[PDB]
Structures are given as C-alpha cells and as structure tokens.
From Swiss-Prot:
It catalyses: L-glutamyl-[protein] + S-adenosyl-L-methionine = [protein]-L-glutamate 5-O-methyl ester + S-adenosyl-L-homocysteine. Keywords: Chemotaxis, Methyltransferase, S-adenosyl-L-methionine, Transferase. The keyword Methyltransferase applies. InterPro entries: Bact_Chemotaxis_MeTrfase, CheR_C, CheR_MeTrfase, CheR_N, CheR_N_sf, SAM-dependent_MTases_sf. This is Chemotaxis protein methyltransferase. The lineage of its organism: Bacteria, Bacillati, Bacillota, Bacilli, Bacillales. It is an enzyme of class 2 (transferase). It comes from Bacillus subtilis (strain 168). GO terms for molecular function: protein methyltransferase activity; protein-glutamate O-methyltransferase activity. Monomer. S-adenosyl-L-methionine binds at N66, S68, R72, E106, D129, N184, L185, R200, N201. Methylation of the membrane-bound methyl-accepting chemotaxis proteins (MCP) to form gamma-glutamyl methyl ester residues in MCP. CheR is responsible for the chemotactic adaptation to repellents.
Length: 255
C-alpha cells in the first residue's frame, strides 16, 4: 500500500504518525499537495521531503486547515469569561495550555482575556504546535486585521501597536506570559496540573480512536475542577467515564 509505506516514512522524518489521522482525508490533502508540486507518487514525494527541509516544513504547515483568528467563535469566549473563569480561578496563578495554537491567535486571545481580569493572581500559557513555521509567526506576534475582526477595539488598542494600516503587533506585556513550544499531542509527554486546556480545531483531524486516547491524557493533565475547552464542532461522549462533567457546551470540568 503506497500510503502505508509513505506513512512509515513520514513518521520516521517528523515523528507524526499519520495512522492517527483520518486516512481518506489526510491521504487526499497530501496527494493534492505533492501533485501541486508535480510529484507523481508518494514514493517520489517522500524522497524529496528527506532532501528538502523547507518542503518538509512546508508540508507540516499544510497538513491541516490552519487559518485562525482571535476569539474564534467569539460568543464561546464570553462563556469562558463569565461562566468558566469563576469555576477555575483560585489564589494561585492560572496555568493554561493552548494545545495546537497554530499562528498564535488563540494563545494571544487567552492572554488578553486573562490580563483584563483585575486581581487574577497571574497567568501562564504554554502554547504548542507541531508546525514550526506557525510557531515562528506566533512568536513574532504580528497580525493583519483579517485575524482580529472579533477583537473589541479597546482591547486592540490596549494590547497591540498598530504599525501600519491593517497591521498590528502584540505588546511584550502579553508575550511575556506565553511560552511557544514545539510539541506533538500524539507522541510527546504532557505537562500536568493545568487549570485550563484549550484544544480547538485539531481533534477534527485525528481518528476517533486517537482523540479518545487524547481526552483521557487531557483529563489527566487537568487539576481537579480545571476545564477543557474544545472547538465548536467537537464533543466528548460519556465525559463521566473520563471524570469530566460538561460545564456549558464545549467546556468540560474535571470533577
Ligand atoms: N499531532 C499534533 N500535535 C499538535 N498540533 C497539531 C498536531 N496535528 C496538527 N496540529 C496543528 O493543529 C492546528 C489546527 S488549526 C487550529 C488552531 C487554533 N486552536 C484554532 O482554533 O483556530 C494546526 O496548526 C496544526 O499544525
């Protein structure tokens, strides 16, 4: 099976195991991507990826639909703000994970939302992705207005400089609370004791079996009463089996 042989090679080069991704769907996206570059097989595509780092980094950067924006599904962030933050705040700083942060819109949202919380003891956000080019971009912190349409104007004025007409940059007072790190949700060790884990619009790529395994690792990585925030098409069935209780739509609390 040519995709089988290719999956083996990709795992060896990047540690990413495509057997843990929906097959028909990823197989089609990657066929499309090698064909656009005029490869004629996975075999030939694999050979180039081993010899061209840029092609490899480009391919990781193209294995999902990764366009993002601040406050993606804006009303869910008000839920987080009003309904969820009271459940998780304690006397200690909040420890947050933005798991699959892409170009950084999400973790920056989290930081700007949390900074507005007067008297919150502190906040710490780990922001991870497998895509190093997206992490590079997130670190730089420069966004075009298209990524900021849901940022309320006072928040945009407070936490970014506007450097040109539709070009803004996140201030250091926000960046300093975020650590951008290369990390594979499917393979790498998870830190522990998070108050909040935000993992949105990534599980959609994984097989049912792979994401079920990741819900249990996440439930484990939460402090008791901590919360998991998922994407607006995602759902965990029988959350009680993971020791999670649904808090509002798309939020799960560790009991
Ligand atoms: N195994 C894996 N571990 C970590 N990140 C992964 C991954 N597989 C894919 N990704 C990343 O998942 C991202 C999905 S885009 C979603 C970004 C953001 N959470 C939002 O909601 O808009 C991409 O940046 C892709 O690089």
């Amino acid at each position: 099976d040519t995709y089988s042989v290719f999956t083996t090679k990709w795992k060896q080069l990047t540690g990413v195991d495509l057997t843990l991704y929906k097959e028909a769907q990823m197989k089609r996206r990657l066929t499309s991507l090698y064909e656009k570059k005029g490869f004629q097989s996975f075999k030939d595509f694999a050979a180039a990826l081993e010899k061209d780092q840029a092609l490899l980094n480009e391919t990781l950067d193209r294995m999902t639909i990764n366009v993002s924006e601040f406050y993606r599904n804006y009303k869910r962030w008000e839920v987080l703000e009003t309904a969820i933050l009271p459940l998780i705040k304690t006397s200690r700083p909040l420890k947050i994970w933005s798991a699959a942060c892409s170009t950084g819109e999400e973790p920056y949202t989290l930081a700007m939302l949390l900074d507005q919380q007067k008297g919150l003891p502190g906040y710490q956000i780990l922001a991870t992705d497998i895509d190093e080019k997206a992490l590079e971009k997130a670190k730089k912190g420069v966004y075009q207005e298209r990524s900021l349409q849901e940022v309320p104007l006072s928040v945009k004025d407070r936490y970014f400089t506007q450097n040109a007409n539709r070009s803004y940059e996140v201030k250091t007072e926000i960046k300093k609370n975020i650590t951008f790190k290369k990390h594979n949700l499917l393979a790498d060790r998870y830190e522990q004791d998070f108050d909040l884990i935000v993992c949105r619009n990534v599980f959609i790529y994984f097989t049912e079996s792979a994401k079920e395994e990741l819900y249990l690792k996440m439930a484990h990585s939460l402090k008791k009463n901590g919360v998991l925030f998922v994407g607006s098409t995602e759902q965990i069935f029988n959350p009680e089996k993971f020791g999670l209780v649904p808090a509002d739509t798309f939020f799960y609390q560790k009991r």
